[PDB]
Amino acid sequence: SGFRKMAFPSGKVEGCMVQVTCGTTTLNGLWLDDVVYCPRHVICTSEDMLNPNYEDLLIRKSNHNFLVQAGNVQLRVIGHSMQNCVLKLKVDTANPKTPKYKFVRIQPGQTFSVLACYNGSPSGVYQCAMRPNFTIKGSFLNGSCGSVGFNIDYDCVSFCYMHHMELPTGVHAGTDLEGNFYGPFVDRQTAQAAGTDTTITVNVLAWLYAAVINGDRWFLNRFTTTLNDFNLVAMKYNYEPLTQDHVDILGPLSAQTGIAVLDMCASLKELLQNGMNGRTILGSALLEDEFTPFDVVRQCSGVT
Amino acid sequence: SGFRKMAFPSGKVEGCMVQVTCGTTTLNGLWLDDVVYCPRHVICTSEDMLNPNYEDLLIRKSNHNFLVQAGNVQLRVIGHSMQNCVLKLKVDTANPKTPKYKFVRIQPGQTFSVLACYNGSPSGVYQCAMRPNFTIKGSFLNGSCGSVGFNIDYDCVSFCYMHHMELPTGVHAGTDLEGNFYGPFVDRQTAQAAGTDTTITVNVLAWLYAAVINGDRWFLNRFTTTLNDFNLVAMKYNYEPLTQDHVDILGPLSAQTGIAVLDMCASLKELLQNGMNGRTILGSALLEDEFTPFDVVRQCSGVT
């Protein structure tokens, strides 16, 4: 028993982190096979970021201007190309520590592990969610760009996120491993607005199921509701509308607990309308939405 | 910016996890040099746990009864000994992945990373604190015994905890790497009581400093207090008494923010007496006590 915001073991990803330097800018890169992936803003100076013309900026750079260092050994750059907002530096040596991997574009609401890095060296690992507004609420300082988000399926690492920027509002924005930003964000020092951040309803429900499995049952009531009635309450509280897909996805948790999904929705509805009244659920005084139904099942079944 | 419950990168520890089997019981072991460390309750059956005589039980076991497996290769056991509540299985092969390491007994209030494992395979990593009552609020299922807690200083892993048991109350108990339980707990299936769990005051203060550094300043007031006045309020709320040592330890955070420690104590005092009034601090609706002042400084400075 017990319920924690658990991250995937980061060892497979640590073996891929390298330092990429371009002029005075140093950030992190991901070394997989003979390719180093990093944010393209490595080629920018503080002045360039205001309105950078990356194609023009990249033309002034040659293979030898990109210093790639894995641990203490220098990698030789034999090719460079820009794929959307990521630079792909072709190196002459394949990473001997390359794990089995995929590049995946995650959906909003999905979760992933972040290995926060500085100078190609990992400093910490934490679990987070892609917000419905496509931002992430991470913990990143300057130097952390190129730090990656991933999930692991037994031995295959699915790289889903590369950190690029912190918006003036303190939230984080980045790309998938093909250089495509999640959301409307651009890699430019300009006024960028994240949309309204809504609450991942299916995740909160999954976490309520985790609470019940772990003995915290105080919030369970004698009521039920319907999808349309629950959604009327969800919209008022800036919660994502719950669909039959979400109900089906909660099927295993509903079967494990013997509590119907709509019954859990009525409990959630009362928690929204009345608050926690000073009580806690799984050591939290608010409704947690950064555990998918898959994360709950995995944590409560010990998937290695 | 951003503040997350960050764990140390677990790669160095993953390379030490092995599976230890003794009869029908399989748990995790820590392989460092030519020694495998694991909970001594590996030699018990369900009936033994009621009142086990471990010296008598261990005598019926020989080197060949302890099956140690690292990945898919079997390790040959050439020696076995009991050191307090841990078994030390001497193997004939040194772990080629043994990192630089220390065995340290942590203090209550200190934090550490847990690499939760099942069948010698890691499943997740999370950050936690040794509670003042010496329990840990982890996420462990059956099979997780032998999972370790650690801290990293650049390249040296300091092993501080080995998971042994879940108390009937859902909290977790374990030992240091010398087999000594943290707290009054014994490795027996009996009624064991954890003391009153108090709140780590210095940690909450450090987290209030992290909040101020990260832009959350709403809780800052025009008041101050004294150590004795603050402690009068701390005792009422089951908070640890704050000492001059704690004030000194908060020195770097107080210098960074320009907010005196006693001024932060007055804010904490008002948060205790009046609650958060529906507001949040660093995305939390309660006072977080699982970040030491060292964790805050590290996270806010990017120590790799």
Ligand SMILES: O=C(Cc1cncc2ccccc12)Nc1ccccc1
């Ligand atoms: O935002 C970043 C990098 C960054 C990321 N996370 C956290 C950061 C904290 C402080 C400084 C920088 C951080 N780059 C950038 C700079 C200007 C305009 C566009 C992008």
Ligand SMILES: O=C(Cc1cncc2ccccc12)Nc1ccccc1
């Ligand atoms: O508590 C444990 C192992 C354990 C640990 N964490 C979580 C667990 C969850 C379920 C079952 C077992 C767990 N061993 C033990 C059994 C009986 C008496 C004394 C100790």
